[PDB]
Amino acid sequence: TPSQQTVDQMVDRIMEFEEGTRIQLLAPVVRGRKGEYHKLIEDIKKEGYVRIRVDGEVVDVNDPVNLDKNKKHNIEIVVDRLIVRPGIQKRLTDSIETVLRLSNGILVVDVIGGKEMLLSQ
Amino acid sequence: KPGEHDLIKGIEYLDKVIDIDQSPIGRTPRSNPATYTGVFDFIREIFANTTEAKTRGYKAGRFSFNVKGGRCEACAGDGINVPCEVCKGKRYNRETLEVRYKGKNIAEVLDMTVEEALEFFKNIPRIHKKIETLYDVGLGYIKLGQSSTTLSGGEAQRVKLATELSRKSTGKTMYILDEPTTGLHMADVHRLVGILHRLVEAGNSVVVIEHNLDVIKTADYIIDLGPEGGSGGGLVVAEGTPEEVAKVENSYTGQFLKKVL
Amino acid sequence: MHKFKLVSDYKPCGDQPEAIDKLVEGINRGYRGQTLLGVTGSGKTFTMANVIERVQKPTLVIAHNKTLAAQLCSEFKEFFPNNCVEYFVSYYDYYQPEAYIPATDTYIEKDSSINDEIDKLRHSATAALFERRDVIIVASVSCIYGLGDPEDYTDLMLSLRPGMIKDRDEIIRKLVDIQYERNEIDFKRGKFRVRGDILEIFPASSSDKVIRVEFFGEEIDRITEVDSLTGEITGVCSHVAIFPASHYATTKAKMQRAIASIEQELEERVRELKSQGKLLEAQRLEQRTRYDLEMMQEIGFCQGIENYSRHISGRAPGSPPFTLIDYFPKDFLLIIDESHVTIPQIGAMYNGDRSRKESLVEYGFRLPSAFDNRPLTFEEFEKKINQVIFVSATPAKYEREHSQQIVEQIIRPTGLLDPEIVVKPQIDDLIGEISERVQKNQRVMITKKMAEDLTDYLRELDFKVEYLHDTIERMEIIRNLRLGVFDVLVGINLLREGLDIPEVSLVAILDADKEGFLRSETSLIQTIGRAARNVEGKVIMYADTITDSMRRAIDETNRRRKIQSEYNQKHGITPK
Ligand SMILES: Nc1ncnc2c1ncn2[C@@H]1O[C@H](COP(=O)(O)OP(=O)(O)NP(=O)(O)O)[C@@H](O)[C@H]1O
Ligand SMILES: [Zn+2]
């Protein structure tokens, strides 16, 4: 043993949580980098996504934002804000698939009130 | 580019050509009878045309186990890494194995035998023609998804024969076969001879480069070549019906046919 | 309720105001049919725009060819930039309908190609019909072919508002059911994509507006609009509706009823054919119907679904299909451009379709119910007409007999005059006339063996020729004639659209005394009208005999020339 997870494995791992928990699926496009990051934000907004969390705070992509070019920022795209209950396998799998496609094999599950976890292919 | 010749006359009497060559068949884990015969493309299109696949935004490549769009990543689309456990070795993830055509997903369709697929696909004509040809060559017991690496020589040869003989016939096509008997028992030869004679009776023309006497004795015309191999050959030693060739003293094929007819 | 607004610097001149007033008065009175006797170059499009603006009613214009329809659509867009102008023509680049020939026992499969721009224009026209009343549609004879049910089109509209609880999967299924394709890579008209909790829909009607919805739990929060190019917020709307992406939108219950009816009809036809003796045809029909029924049950739609239109829509046997005329309001106005050619085109479609399908149904290939998937007959089209106006240079018997009022527009605004007629009892005279025209920098025109002999003589005697044996070569020949590469042109059939030129000042008719379709009165008038472009253009005839049609044509030409000369002399307008 050298975490390589498939879509089904990630779905099962998320399903292992208790019912009623609030989770958010994130696609981190930038992890530990410094830059103005304006063209990327414009492209993300044009793609269709509206919710983006920066520095751990959720902000709207439409509203203008400011960030230091010499300070590291963790830009993450909020894709879905689901609930944990039986029968949401299809929507959860679709959201995980689009997150993996957008972030190139990196998925971050934000457990509201719990410890965050990271799953990768 | 063709070979060295002056000219060929009579091409205006034909409208198509279908050829089975004397070449090895490649064995890969990504190949099976369904993919080789080209019917898996139609099956995948049918599956991708369903309402569930449209709702989930799937395409024909999603249902291919060689495409990294819907295949299981734990087994890398092969099913075995020891059989896979997350996808149970089916090479498809759980979401792909939910689009059902006539209440059956792609894995069970791949798990059908040719005889089963004859009844299941009895309405779609494009699939039915290929499945019927596979049944005709005598491969009714084979599975549509059996790995080509686990196919025998005769089974692979018959899959190739069905692939090439399941094509459209316009009544003026030319069939060329280069020793299609390799690895075939006397019953499979009987089946192939019946198929070829039905094709000829449909108005077509069949040319077979054969060494089998059972096939030869049923031929209407024979063009012997020789009298030896290499630099000692390249001349027509006999030409006519099998009896006329048998009447030729210096022809080996005639000598061997004399004891058969 | 929007209105009609017209912008044009060119004011009506001559008989245009009188013609417009007469047409408006006749429409207000309630006359079912009228005719505009407008000569070429008199500005019939301007008069049409004026009457449409004055009446303030929906207008459907029918043309006998695609080029004229496109020109009319562009002109109407020019006169009405604020208003709405549509375009409804065939979208088939290459269509080969299936048919069976019992003589050769050969069957040909169906092959078709779809043009995206024409399909988008047709969908825009259909949507605009239900959206705004002040819409003008320029269409070919395709307007009489079977479209979908307007009731199904209206009843299958998705309505979304904020605060309405609804699952995202349910909305996706509803969108798929109205023939919307999900494609996150190729995002074009009539396609939708979903990115997590946000669903984006691109209607097939609009071309630069998308609708974005957001889900928070189990209810929709915001429904906004975003430009397709910039991808930025444009506006927020509370109540929005999505039109179906196909006119042929059907419900699941309708599909099940159609399947049951098709099964019953197939059983009845199989029994009848068994009682007849055509076993092979019955078996082929049973196999094809079973395949189509399985395809309907599993997927829902496929190739060949058009043959079961009567069963799908539930129409009674023999009923005409719903068409674009049914989509129009009952108080609409219809205008037929070049009526003497368009009307026979309308009439011929039903006979052609029935002749094509008779062999197919007879040999047990399609069910007998496939006869109802037919274009409208002439009687049904006439019955569906609320108000009609025929705009043609020469009215035929039908238009003259079916019109309650006849008005004319002869005086051209530019002040041109119709060419005079000179008769002659021929090769030497033609050569001399051609040489004289060459000396005056005027092109000549000549209207198969005789044409070949004439072109051979012209080529021999150091004369440039432009002999014509499609439109692709036609425009090239016209450009060559305009550039002066060829001095004369010879054609077997001098009636192709767009073959007229403004530099032609002399046209000759050879063997006009011989009876023929091209020598009819209407054809003679049409060929004479080509020489009216030149200020000094004249028409000569080479025939030793005269007929009643010739007498009528010459009388009409003389009257038109006399009235044009009187108008130009009394008013003092210089002909230029
Ligand atoms: N690895 C395998 N696992 C399972 N079944 C196999 C495998 N390899 C071959 N088979 C099947 O086992 C049967 C016998 O195969 P094989 O022993 O190769 O036949 P064979 O008698 O040599 N035939 P042939 O060479 O064509 O005359 C066939 O149905 C094969 O498809
Ligand atoms: Zn696996």
DSSP per-residue letters across B196-238: HHHHHHTT-EEEEE---HHHHTT-S-EEEEESSSGGG--EEEE
Q: Does B95 touch chain A (CB under 8 A)?
A: yes
Helix ranges restricted to H, C140-214: 150-155, 168-177
Which chains does chain C touch, 3 or more C-beta pairs < 8 A? A, B
Q: Does C185 touch chain B (CB under 8 A)?
A: no
Q: Please count the other Cβ atoms lying within 10 Å of the Cβ belonging to residue C110.
A: 12
Q: How far apart (Å, rounded) are the C-alpha atoms in residues C538 and C377? A: 42
Tokens of C568: 């130009």
Do residues C265 and C369 lie in contact, with contact meaning Cβ atoms separated by under 8 Å? yes
Q: Return the SS3 of A87.
A: coil
Question: Which ligand is closest to the CA of B32, given by its number?
Answer: 1
Q: From atom 22 of ligand 1, which residue's Cα is the shortest distance away?
A: B152
Q: How far apart (Å, rounded) are the C-alpha atoms in residues B61 and B39? A: 14
Backbone angles phi, psi at C239, to 5 degrees: -105, 125
Q: CB under 8 Å to B213, separation ≥6 — which residues?
A: B256, B257, B260
Contact B61 CB / ligand 1 (< 6 Å): no
Q: From atom 9 of ligand 1, which residue's Cα is the shortest distance away?
A: B150
Do residues B62 and B13 lie in contact, with contact meaning Cβ atoms separated by under 8 Å? no
The amino acid sitting at A116 is E
Nearest CA distance, A26 vs chain B (angstrom): 21
Contact B152 CB / ligand 1 (< 6 Å): yes
Dihedral, C157, C162, C166, C168 alpha carbons, nearest 10: 80
Tokens of B111: 């798990």
Give the residue carrying structure tokens 């210089």: C574
Backbone angles phi, psi at A53, to 5 degrees: -105, 130
Q: From atom 3 of ligand 1, which residue's Cα is the shortest distance away?
A: B150
Looking at chain C, which residue has its C-alpha nearest residue B103? C298
Q: Which residues from chain B sit within 8 angstroms of residue C176, using beta carbons?
A: 51, 54-55
Atom of ligand 1 nearest to the CA of B141: 29
The closest of C283, C280, C282, C288 to C308, measured between CA atoms, is C288
**C45 annotated as ligand-binding:** yes
Q: Return the SS3 of B168.
A: coil
Do residues C20 and C54 lie in contact, with contact meaning Cβ atoms separated by under 8 Å? yes
Nearest CA distance, A69 vs chain C (angstrom): 25
Q: Return the SS3 of C284.
A: helix
CB contact under 8 A, B74 and A90: no
Q: Which residues from chain C sit within 8 angstroms of residue B126, using beta carbons?
A: none
The amino acid sitting at C364 is G
CB contact under 8 A, B93 and A8: yes
**C40 annotated as ligand-binding:** yes
Give the residue carrying structure tokens 């509209």: C157
Distance (angstroms) between ligand 2 centre and the Cα of B68 equals 12
Helix ranges restricted to H, C12-65: 16-29, 44-55
The closest of B28, B18, B42, B36 to B158, measured between CA atoms, is B36
Q: What share of chain C is helix, strand, coil (3-state, %, to 5)?
A: 45, 20, 35
Distance (angstroms) between ligand 1 centre and the Cα of B154 equals 9
CB contact under 8 A, C298 and B101: yes
Q: How far is the CA of C248 from the CAs of A8, C76, C151, C308, in angstroms?
A: 39, 29, 11, 12
Do residues A79 and A98 lie in contact, with contact meaning Cβ atoms separated by under 8 Å? yes
CB contact under 8 A, A9 and B72: no
Q: How far apart (Å, rounded) are the C-alpha atoms in residues C571 and C576? A: 14
Do residues A80 and A52 lie in contact, with contact meaning Cβ atoms separated by under 8 Å? no
Q: What share of chain B is helix, strand, coil (3-state, %, to 5)?
A: 40, 15, 45
Q: How far apart (Å, rounded) are the C-alpha atoms in residues C193 and C543? A: 71
CB contact under 8 A, C212 and A47: no
Do residues C563 and C410 lie in contact, with contact meaning Cβ atoms separated by under 8 Å? yes
Nearest CA distance, A89 vs chain C (angstrom): 12
Q: CB under 8 Å to C321, separation ≥6 — which residues?
A: C145, C146, C147, C309, C313, C315, C372, C373, C374, C376
Contact B27 CB / ligand 1 (< 6 Å): no
The amino acid sitting at C513 is D
Chain A contact probe: residue of C197, C199, C201, C202 with most A CBs at under 10 A: C197
Q: Please count the other Cβ atoms lying within 10 Å of the Cβ belonging to residue C6.
A: 15
Distance (angstroms) between ligand 2 centre and the Cα of C66 equals 57
Q: CB under 8 Å to C383, separation ≥6 — which residues?
A: none
Give CB contacts under 8 A, 24+ apart, made by C38-41: C38/C391, C38/C393, C38/C408, C38/C409, C38/C410, C39/C393, C39/C409, C39/C410, C39/C412, C39/C418, C39/C529, C39/C532, C39/C560, C40/C393, C40/C529, C40/C532, C41/C412, C41/C414, C41/C416, C41/C532, C41/C533
The closest of C409, C405, C399, C404 to C339, measured between CA atoms, is C399
The amino acid sitting at C228 is S
Atom of ligand 1 nearest to the CA of B153: 26
CA neighbours within 13 Å on the CB side: how many for C66? 9
Atom of ligand 1 nearest to the CA of B151: 31
The total number of residues shown for chain A amounts to: 121
Backbone angles phi, psi at C241, to 5 degrees: -135, 150
Nearest CA distance, C195 vs chain A (angstrom): 7
How many CB pairs below 8 Å do chains B and C form together?
29
Q: What is the DSSP letter of C541?
A: E
Q: How far apart (Å, rounded) are the C-alpha atoms in residues B50 and B56? A: 10
Ligand 1 test: best mutation among B152, B160, B161, B191, most atoms within 8 Å of CB? B152
**Strand-pair partners of C111:** C96
Q: How far apart (Å, rounded) are the C-alpha atoms in residues B92 and B90? A: 5
What technique determined this structure? Answer: cryo-EM
The closest of B259, B253, B212 to B233, measured between CA atoms, is B253
**C42 annotated as ligand-binding:** yes
List strands edge to edge, sheet with C504-510.
C420-424, C538-542, C504-510, C443-446, C488-490
Q: Return the SS3 of C554.
A: helix
Do residues A120 and A5 lie in contact, with contact meaning Cβ atoms separated by under 8 Å? yes
